[PDB]
Amino acid sequence: ALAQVERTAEGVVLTLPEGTVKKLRLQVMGERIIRVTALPGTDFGIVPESIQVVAKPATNVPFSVDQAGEKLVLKTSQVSAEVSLLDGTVSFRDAKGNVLLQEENRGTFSPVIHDPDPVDADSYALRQEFNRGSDEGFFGLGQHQNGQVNYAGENVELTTYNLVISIPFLVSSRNYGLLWDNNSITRFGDPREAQPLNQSLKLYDAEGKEGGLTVRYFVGDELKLTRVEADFNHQFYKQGNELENPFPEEVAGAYKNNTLRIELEGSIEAQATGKHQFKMYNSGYAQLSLDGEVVLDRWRMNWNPWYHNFYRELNAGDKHKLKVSWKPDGGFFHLRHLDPLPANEQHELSLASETGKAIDYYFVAGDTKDDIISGYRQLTGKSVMLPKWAYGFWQSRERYKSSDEIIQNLKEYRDRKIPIDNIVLDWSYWPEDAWGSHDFDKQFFPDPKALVDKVHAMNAQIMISVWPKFYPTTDNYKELNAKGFMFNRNLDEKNLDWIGKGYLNAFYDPFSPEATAIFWKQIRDKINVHGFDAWWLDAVEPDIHSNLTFEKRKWLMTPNARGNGAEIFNAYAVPHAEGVYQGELATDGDKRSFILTRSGFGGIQRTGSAIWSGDIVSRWSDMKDQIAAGIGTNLAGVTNWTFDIGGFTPEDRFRHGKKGFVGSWTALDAEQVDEWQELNTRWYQFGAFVPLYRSHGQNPYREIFNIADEGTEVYNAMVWYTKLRYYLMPYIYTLGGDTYHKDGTIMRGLVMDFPNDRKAWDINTQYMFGPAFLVNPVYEYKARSRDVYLPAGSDWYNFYTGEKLAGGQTITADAPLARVPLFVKAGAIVPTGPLIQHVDEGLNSPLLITVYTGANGSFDIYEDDGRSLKYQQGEWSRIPLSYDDVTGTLIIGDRVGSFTGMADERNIRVRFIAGPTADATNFDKAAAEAVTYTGKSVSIKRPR
Template sequence: MSSIAIRPWMPLCMLTLAVLAGCGKAPEPADAAKSAGHAQKLADGVIVRLDHSPQQVRLQAVDERIVHVTAVPEGAFDLPASLMAVKSGGDTLFTVDETPDTVTLKTPRLSAQVSLHDGAVRFLDAAGKPLLAERAGGRSFQPETVEGKPYYTVRQRFDSPADEAFYGLGQHQDGQMNYKGEDVELAQHNMDVGVPFVVSTRNYGLLWDNNSITRFGDPREYQPLSQTLKLYDADGKAGGLTASYYDAGGTLKLKRVEKQPDYQYLKDIAQWPAASPAKTTAKVVWEGSIEPTVPGVHKLRLYASSYAKVWLDGKLVYDDWRQNWNPWYHNLRLTMDAGSKHQLRIEWLPNEGYLTLLHLDPLPGDEQQELSLSSEVGHAVDYYFIAGDNLDQVIAGYREVTGKATLLPRWAYGLWQSRERYKTQAEIFDTARRYRALGLPIDNLVEDWNYWPEDAWGSHEFDKARFPDPKGMLDQLHAMHLQLMISVWPKFYPGTANYKELDAKGYIYRRNVEKGERDWIGNGYLSSFYDPYAKEARAIYWRQIHDRLGVLGIDGWWLDASEPDIQSNLDIAERKLRMGPTALGPGAAFFNSYPLMHTTGVYQGARASTPDKRVFILTRSAFAGQQRNAAATWSGDVASRWSNLHDQISAGVNFSLAGIPNWTTDIGGFALEPRYEKPDAADLAEWRELNLRWFQFGAFTPLFRSHGQFPYREIYNLAAPGTSVYEALAYYDRLRYRLMPYIYTLAGDTWWKDGTIMRGLVMDFPGDPKVRDIDDEYLFGPAFLVAPVTAYRATARPVYLPAGTRWYDFHSGKSYEGGSSIDAPAPLERMPLFVRAGAIVPTGPAIQYTGEQPDAPIVLLVYAGADGHFTLYEDEGTSYDYEHGHYSRIPLAYDDATGVLTLGRREGDGRGAPARRQFVIRRIDAGHPNADGADASHDVRVGYNGSEVKVPR
């Protein structure tokens, strides 16, 4: 056995004779490999040659807890540079050992072993306890040719014990929280964000370094029903389903047998029967039976827009609505025996929408329960194994590899008011004035798309008829302590000078124009998107938006359609062609990474142009590493439905667990059913309640943002001042601002501590197995447990309070022991909200914007029942001074046994925070429940000048 400890800076004469022939010149790599048997030692790791296989495996020690694994089917490791990773190796001390069966790379914290027989890699902690193991024979490379270039379809399978749970992977809006045994496709789409980073309850994460469409779980694409099932019509005849097409009067226009519903994409609409034209068909029904050829749990996936219902064996399993132009998936499961028949019925009101139903047979054995990642296009199996003592350390490791999360400006954490869309400069001013006149706190207004002349998308110019003085508008908003974010797309009309400049250098995707596709504006215009994979293209794009918009004083950049959505509802094969070829290769090879490259150009350009002003980017899509670009993500064009509200919770939590801390949603849902446009009394009541419940949830998400189509979403437009709904909306707006010292500390911790704002329960309560599958609760920072109400007319809801602590109802002060479920009160005006014992929650005064009264007293809500810690963070709020030591951190520690609260010595130079300030200590316990933290009768006031202060009970 050979063993060597290596650091990149180590003098050659310190290396053992296992690597060098002496203290002179290092051998060439071939000599090193020969001298070490199967191990070719590198400065940061080792390359392992296998027995009887052309495969090679490379291990690189990124740090003590992170190992970069790369496996190639043959040849060398001359691979393209990673887009997501900023660090692929490191200077960590490690050893390499070889036995007849394995090569092991070992750091002080973990080991990675490569089997010389099949190349499978095992990971063990410092004590030798297994953490994760590739399944023997679980790595595969299938040669593929993409646009004439050689690639592989790659897959890696890992063993997974039954009690393991998985999270992360980005944002997927189908109600999934724990991904164990689930299928998740990572393919950027409006509402769906693929981030190939998964975390485990075994305290590790896998970052899968691949830019193409990737699948967690089943590697197969879902198939048409007729390819995997036997179909029978309504009369029991084999061959297909009975399809019935009705007009608006209920008259049957056509009845025929179809292989399946097949209206998934634009190209499929051409199949619509002439006997019942799409524009006149009011209802389609498919009915019959399905029969599997293999037993097990079968997977069905509905893809639908407009109103649709699905029954399986007479049970209604889906009943929902989506806007017709934005269909989405819904997973269904049905246990079936081979040869058994099961009734299927689908009812659809098409309204020019889309619908299909797809299927997959069960995977063999326990393969569905494995950890499996596969990608359509790649050169290698390439991933990072990241270990930690907890999930916070795992996420910190992800950011070590992909880049730290930059701190957003403080105003970004205030209220955002937006609509689709403010059509004139006057409408923006009216909104600003109304909020200020009503005393409703707000920091940000948003100008959505189409502020440009109709025929000039991509010009980045305001239509002078509707926006006569953009610079003056910005100046007046800033004088009112309001910021403006503006929508800027990667889309261009060919007639614009910006298109022509980019196209002349080959930086426009031309296929959409060549196909003659016209968009939905006016009579329709030709358009396409630019290619951000070229550094020069990114620089040109930034210059174009900066010279037209940035110079006006725009505060934030809304990068819409960043999937990219060049034309909605194209089939995937055509999408791959329309988004390429990129400067780096075929669109299929870079399907998921467009938003990363797009935000990279804007972030780097903005920091260079305005180095003292924090960048803020909002984008509809994201990819691994995007947190380093000051980019927040919102959940896309979700519908104003209770089901969509519910699905936002797991979507936001898993997005956060994928390592990107700033996330938001369109409060109230973006697109809404026609019944809400001109509502009767009953629909108006539901509309207001839906918006209020969504607003309550939004107040406890990283970014607090209201946006949507008509009716308007401003607080005063949702309900009249003085009404109960208005007062409840105003309460949560003001509560958000009262909590700003707490919230901005959470924001600061995303940079200082690699923190996560919207936290899955499993992060803080890993020892409580009951929290693993809860998909409608989460933690907002370390203190708050949030339980949104997602059912109409609900006045209570069950809430599970995790074990290991006591919990206080924030509104009533009543406390509960954790480890049990309660029926939590949820009157319309309040959302169930709990604070755990030991929490220290800094709160501020009633303010109208985040930068108001920075020297006001801070009220510390101290929840008795456990020891507690928190660190109050402050800085200047809008610059990057914090990166240079200009900040204030005040450690806070509560000793429950003595009742002493310690205000620790200030950390940092204190710039950006008052040198002296007042703290108000408000203890909350059984004797002083202090409902909603408002009872000041037992307050203790203390002064603070940066030195330690102990405040007794």
């Protein structure tokens, strides 16, 4: 029996005769975008209004429907959707008959198993499988902490955490991507949550006896207890600061005073042959060895543990020695594992969500990755312009403790002529017992408006922290609570926070606009009136109480406006930021707002928000990981992204020592100076080349002049990259402009610009920063060089020396401490400006246009006032640059557009780099041909 077909204004709806899926709907969303919804019922009305997707079915996109035999074809000018009338499965082809994406079945619905709260009768766990046996690459999915760039053949858990941001937009190496529109925890690859080690492995203790691993408890170096445990688990608190599983009385005290250390020893045995995944969740110091070799070596501060993963091929029956050393230092630990999927499911695309009413996704065709990202922006909203200053240098601290401290640090930068735009006030400016009141403690912040006025008189901006957190004693808590907008379970649980004796606290429910409107009005009345420029919306996972099980985290958010916590687990940040963004629009409809927030989801970019990777650690491995973290965030369609340069929490050896608390580097124990300075030097280098450039963290102090003394190599190196950031502002703000006007992506995985170079896909230590710069951060202590793969199909220039190199090879790039290896793509046209201390000083600046010869080029410099919403009414300009390598001619074309404050006349000089030159980065002094530009096209010829 064949499925019945109904033609609609938006596409078609099939009614399937047999199977769990009763109806399959296709909706045309754009020339390149088709929505697929598989429904285990007859009423599409049960699918909740999307949080990610703001787009509606198109009304101006022609499409055709042809039905013949057992196939129905729906197509637009760019996409063909072929649907089986036998089983309702969909296959997508491009305009030229190429198969991009093929459903392997009609999808799997099954009972919700990860929702601690009562589950609706029409809610299910969902899974959809595509493209079995495909060799494609997969990218995006957001910000993850396991170094993955090409996810193909691996697992990714799309959850929400301090360190992890899920954006369920998937990009293929093929000419498509897809938005999976589900708000609950989602899994790419294996649909199963990782298991305890003994669920699908045989365990043997240190003596070979089956049953569990040998566990040794040491106090200092004295062994206190040995025993065999099937599942060593100290992963979460059940409540307050009490573990679900306490330590034995022999060592419980040692846990509390950090003298405890533990060893696990035994053997593991696969029951099935194939690729197994292992995940070591921990804070404190952990090292794991397999077959006598160290596989993982990690540290995180106790209160912010995470999973550290590896995959390994195992044969059924084989025994492998496992050794773990773990010094908890008050932290957490659990070892997890997944055995191979069934044969046919191992090489395929699989997406699964914990709870939903239907399988609901959007197929997005695109000839380039930029095109695919554009489909994401069309579905979930434009990346609205940040203020230009958001792209300048940010200085932050956990935490500045008074107005004077803020002013003094900003002034110190200005006094040292180190460029800076923004400074940040972290938590705790309010009276101690009044978190949520948004009042300023008179003792430390006596006059918040005077504070803002001084920052502004120094031509800088100030951002201030605001959490979703309220103490029940505050008027603000009470106003929100009276309308049912507070998640009060955390009060019932009596989970006290870390301040003083500890305070009862709750987080509000941002899932209805009525709630977010109140939240906004409160900060409008208390904080916005003082002139603060930006909102640091922290802890928006939400992190109501750290280190509870994820089930408890779900439960704490029940009930909410959209249902259970499990149903919207990944989506908190969007409605929250949106309330603030909409509030700002209603307040001043001509000033760009700015939000920095610690979580995200599809659509976050429509709220004028950047996101950051949260409380990472001052560790090389973390620094390395931030590369994949940013690449995946950008490939998921969210480009304004950043991190704490230097990491958030350093190890104790950095935080104090023989002289007590370490503020300035001068207080470090002598033997810690070198690494502290080197790590920060490398991390500043890296940070200068991510979308937002921001120093932040717990002590030591992170200002450049607190990391090292003036005149030193490291001080000079940090200053040089900060200055370079500003020299590049014409280039960088062009990228900033493109994020909005061209659905642009700033921090680019190599697959974006080298889609046909299969070797480039997997790389997780390099990326393109805009169209010109191949960035290659140094992530190893003491390294003075590193391998750099130069993508094929282009030649490359050493940015610092002018040396030209052929593409399609790996080199050992020179990487002295003072420099990060940087290469420029031939044909690049890079505009720089003069040295400036903050962005507005650079408005209408003289320009140096540097052409990197050897191929044609094209770059249109975007400029506008940098602050207002006028760009939305067309107030902006582009100065088009195009280079023809055959004739050696750079054309500065007719200026497009204009804006209030724009200079009609510009001094522009042009130079060409074709090889080694001593002036490669001497912008001010380089020989260049000068032109007086007045908006009309001029041509500059390369010198013979």
